[PDB]
Amino acid sequence: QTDMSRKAFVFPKESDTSYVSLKAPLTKPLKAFTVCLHFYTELSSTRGYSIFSYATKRQDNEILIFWSKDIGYSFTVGGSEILFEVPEVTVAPVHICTSWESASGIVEFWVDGKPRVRKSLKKGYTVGAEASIILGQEQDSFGGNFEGSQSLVGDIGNVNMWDFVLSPDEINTIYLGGPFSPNVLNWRALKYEVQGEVFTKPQLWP
Amino acid sequence: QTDMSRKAFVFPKESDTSYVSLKAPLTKPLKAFTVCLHFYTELSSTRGYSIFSYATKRQDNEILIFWSKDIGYSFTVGGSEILFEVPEVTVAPVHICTSWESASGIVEFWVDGKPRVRKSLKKGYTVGAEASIILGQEQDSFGGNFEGSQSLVGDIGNVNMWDFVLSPDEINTIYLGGPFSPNVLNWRALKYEVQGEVFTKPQLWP
Amino acid sequence: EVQLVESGGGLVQTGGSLRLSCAASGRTFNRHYMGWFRQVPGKEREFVASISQTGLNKDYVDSAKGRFTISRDNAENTVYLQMNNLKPEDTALYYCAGSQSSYYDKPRLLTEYAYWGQGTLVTVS
Amino acid sequence: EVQLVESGGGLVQTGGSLRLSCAASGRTFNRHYMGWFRQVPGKEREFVASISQTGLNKDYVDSAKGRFTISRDNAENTVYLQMNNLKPEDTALYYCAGSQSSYYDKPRLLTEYAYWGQGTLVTVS
Amino acid sequence: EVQLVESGGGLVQTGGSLRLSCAASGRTFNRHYMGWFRQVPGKEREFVASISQTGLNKDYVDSAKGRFTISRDNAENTVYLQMNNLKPEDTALYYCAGSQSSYYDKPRLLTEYAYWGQGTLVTVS
């Protein structure tokens, strides 16, 4: 494991080969989880891009958070999708924490600490454990088929994922930088495999 | 009884059967009351919905707090209605306290601890105590006949209702979250029954 | 300030139905309550029904209740009065009236109303 | 609320290709999912495929997968259905429909869909 | 000089009916003799029928005789071809075409016809 603290990956030029591969020790399939991350880019006023790509062998889009141009944040699980519309786009680092639970289908979406209304998805579904997680490319196959129009140019960090829903308090602690313990993906014990033009630098965001 | 403190209901899908029925120990008819509640939804820009429904066997609209599209808050008592226009709307959790007096017919309307002008409504009336209170639906009958276009999607908590008019100071204390003793409906001693897709979750609003 | 027009009148045999409509010219229509009134030769206009600006509260006369329905489309800013159970007597002129530029209840008088339409004729054979 | 039109139909020999297109009149097009349905004389319409609003999630019928492709261009708000290796049975009317001004997954029924186009004819010789 | 646009094509059951029409843009329409031509993929166009200016002298192909009809209108300057009891084989693209800056009979060759339309697909199952 390598401590990524106070550091971030940089994707300086749009391309279809620069990507980072993450490795999950996960064994049991997930009924629930909470993804939290911090990303920065100016592409908003331009084509769409993929923030986080989770793909099992039987579905390229098990979980994909995606910014859709003029639309906003697009969350999808198990092949379904819902859109969290955004009226106007600013230009600044943004933190986002999203939860989904298989029992109730409730999805929570916290942007910069401010929660969006809860909605429903795929009640009763289950997520396989054996998967590939990639940063900087939307994969339409298990480990390839990265399209150039969808790659991310910019910065990403603090990537963290649990196997259960955090309470609002815990999310507030995370957004404020307090101590916590990831159990499926730890930024502080991360294990990865870089590919192409990606570098490691100090984080810009506070 | 159940303590609902720090907890709220969730209505994740726009549907006609999901609703919660409230019960009250009230026996004497009401000459005055005040109702306070917090609620959060995103339907504001899309269509109208019903916040609180009080009905009796002789009148389906004894007391109706309803959001009308492009109008604002529409307060109804004893089959008469008034409007409290809202010029523009924003996506945020909102707390509202509304009082009415039979003696004078005066009505107070506090949204986010900011008071609307007092107005008159149905002076000399009486409100019957025997009644059915419902959340998540607008009820055109005492036990049914709901409308999907009018059901609400989102969260509603802190529902408290008195049998007399609070003074402005007391309303301020309610807004900031101090200790208070509701006499008719108590969030901290609530009795209720749930039907359809509705859930209990930690509250989002602070 | 709105200008009221009406349509859907005509003659029908007893037991028929008629979905009379009323259109409003203006932008404040969603701030005025609407109403339907009846007029007969050798007599003055009579209250028939009144409907919510918000549209959630209505008021029917004793004869009309259970037989007639009143609704409004704010997006299309038009009022609809579905008249059924048509007997010979309910054959007269009908007027879609409306006047209110402020929050209030649904009355059953004539002085408050300030704007009137041309009218329509309904006949039962 | 959009108005749907279709083009690109015609007759072709087996093994050919057809890039059918559908145009939408409106400004909320990006807020509606799209779909292609099939119809034959002496029967009802039949699901063919669908396209995501954002344009990242699709759904094909069992016969269409591997042979047909569906895409959408939001800027020009046009839906494209490219079919190849056409078979004689694949000769009927095709409708481009779509109706979820809101946000949800991709269904495979008919009741949810609300708006339909005139249709086009496809024939395999 | 005249622009020919046909319409009325589509899909229908065996032994159906189809009153295809053709509109002509111009002012000499009453001066030309119109014609309907057939064409199938992988082959050339074939004669179908021919309609006259005055409209009293016509010419039908042997197969279409009796089964089909051809007519012309002058006030609306259009042409009509009605086909009944359709079968599978007669399923191809049909062209309302022709060219007549002269005053002559109705031929059956292709060279004489100068102006051509776009054509419409007709199919029978």
CSV table of C-alpha atoms in Angstrom, one decimal, chain E residues 16-124:
chain,number,residue,atom,x,y,z
E,16,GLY,CA,-55.9,-4.5,-50.9
E,17,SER,CA,-56.5,-1.1,-52.4
E,18,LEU,CA,-54.4,2.0,-53.0
E,19,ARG,CA,-55.3,5.4,-54.5
E,20,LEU,CA,-51.8,6.8,-55.1
E,21,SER,CA,-51.7,10.4,-56.2
E,22,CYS,CA,-49.2,12.7,-57.9
E,23,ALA,CA,-48.9,16.5,-57.8
E,24,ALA,CA,-47.3,18.5,-60.6
E,25,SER,CA,-45.7,21.9,-60.0
E,26,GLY,CA,-46.0,24.1,-63.1
E,27,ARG,CA,-48.5,25.6,-65.5
E,28,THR,CA,-48.1,23.3,-68.5
E,29,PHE,CA,-49.5,20.2,-66.7
E,30,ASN,CA,-52.6,20.3,-68.9
E,31,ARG,CA,-50.2,20.2,-71.9
E,32,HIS,CA,-48.3,17.0,-71.0
E,33,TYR,CA,-49.4,13.4,-70.8
E,34,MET,CA,-48.6,11.7,-67.5
E,35,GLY,CA,-47.4,8.2,-66.8
E,36,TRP,CA,-46.7,5.8,-63.9
E,37,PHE,CA,-43.6,3.7,-64.1
E,38,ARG,CA,-42.4,0.8,-61.9
E,39,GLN,CA,-38.9,0.0,-60.7
E,40,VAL,CA,-37.4,-2.8,-58.5
E,41,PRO,CA,-33.9,-3.0,-56.9
E,42,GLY,CA,-31.4,-4.6,-59.2
E,43,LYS,CA,-33.3,-3.8,-62.4
E,44,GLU,CA,-34.5,-0.9,-64.6
E,45,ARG,CA,-37.8,0.9,-64.6
E,46,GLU,CA,-40.9,-0.7,-66.3
E,47,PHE,CA,-44.0,0.9,-67.8
E,48,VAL,CA,-47.1,0.8,-65.7
E,49,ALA,CA,-49.7,3.2,-67.2
E,50,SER,CA,-50.1,6.5,-69.1
E,51,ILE,CA,-52.7,9.3,-68.6
E,52,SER,CA,-53.8,11.9,-71.2
E,53,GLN,CA,-54.1,15.7,-71.2
E,54,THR,CA,-57.8,15.9,-72.1
E,55,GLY,CA,-57.9,12.7,-70.1
E,56,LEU,CA,-60.1,10.7,-72.5
E,57,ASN,CA,-57.4,8.5,-74.1
E,58,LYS,CA,-55.3,6.3,-71.8
E,59,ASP,CA,-53.2,3.2,-71.9
E,60,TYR,CA,-52.9,0.4,-69.4
E,61,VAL,CA,-50.3,-2.4,-69.2
E,62,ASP,CA,-51.7,-5.9,-70.0
E,63,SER,CA,-51.5,-7.1,-66.4
E,64,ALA,CA,-52.9,-3.9,-64.9
E,65,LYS,CA,-55.8,-3.8,-67.4
E,66,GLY,CA,-59.2,-3.8,-65.6
E,67,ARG,CA,-57.5,-4.2,-62.2
E,68,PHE,CA,-56.0,-0.7,-62.1
E,69,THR,CA,-57.2,2.7,-63.2
E,70,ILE,CA,-55.5,6.0,-64.1
E,71,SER,CA,-57.1,9.4,-64.1
E,72,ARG,CA,-56.1,13.0,-64.3
E,73,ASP,CA,-57.4,16.3,-62.9
E,74,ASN,CA,-56.7,19.7,-64.5
E,75,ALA,CA,-58.1,22.2,-62.0
E,76,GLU,CA,-55.9,20.7,-59.3
E,77,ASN,CA,-53.4,19.6,-61.9
E,78,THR,CA,-52.7,16.1,-60.4
E,79,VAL,CA,-52.8,12.5,-61.4
E,80,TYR,CA,-54.4,9.5,-59.7
E,81,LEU,CA,-53.6,5.8,-60.0
E,82,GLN,CA,-55.9,3.4,-58.2
E,83,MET,CA,-54.9,-0.2,-57.7
E,84,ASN,CA,-57.2,-2.9,-56.3
E,85,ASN,CA,-56.6,-6.5,-55.2
E,86,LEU,CA,-52.9,-6.1,-54.7
E,87,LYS,CA,-50.5,-9.1,-54.6
E,88,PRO,CA,-47.0,-9.7,-53.3
E,89,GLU,CA,-45.1,-9.4,-56.6
E,90,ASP,CA,-46.4,-5.9,-57.4
E,91,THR,CA,-44.3,-4.4,-54.6
E,92,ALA,CA,-41.7,-1.9,-55.8
E,93,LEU,CA,-41.2,1.8,-56.2
E,94,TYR,CA,-43.6,3.7,-58.4
E,95,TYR,CA,-42.8,6.8,-60.4
E,96,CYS,CA,-45.2,9.4,-61.6
E,97,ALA,CA,-43.2,10.9,-64.5
E,98,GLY,CA,-43.6,11.9,-68.1
E,99,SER,CA,-42.7,14.9,-70.3
E,100,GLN,CA,-44.8,16.5,-73.0
E,101,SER,CA,-44.1,20.0,-74.5
E,102,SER,CA,-45.8,18.5,-77.5
E,103,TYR,CA,-49.2,17.2,-78.7
E,104,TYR,CA,-49.1,13.5,-79.4
E,105,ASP,CA,-50.3,10.0,-78.4
E,106,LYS,CA,-49.4,7.9,-75.3
E,107,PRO,CA,-46.2,5.8,-75.9
E,108,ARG,CA,-44.8,2.9,-73.9
E,109,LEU,CA,-41.1,3.6,-74.2
E,110,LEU,CA,-38.8,5.2,-71.6
E,111,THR,CA,-36.8,7.6,-73.7
E,112,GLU,CA,-39.8,9.9,-74.5
E,113,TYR,CA,-40.5,10.5,-70.8
E,114,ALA,CA,-38.1,13.3,-69.8
E,115,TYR,CA,-39.3,14.6,-66.4
E,116,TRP,CA,-39.2,12.1,-63.5
E,117,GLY,CA,-40.3,12.2,-59.9
E,118,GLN,CA,-38.8,10.7,-56.8
E,119,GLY,CA,-41.0,7.6,-56.4
E,120,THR,CA,-42.8,5.9,-53.5
E,121,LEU,CA,-42.6,2.4,-52.2
E,122,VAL,CA,-45.6,0.1,-52.4
E,123,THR,CA,-45.6,-3.3,-50.7
E,124,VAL,CA,-48.2,-6.1,-50.2
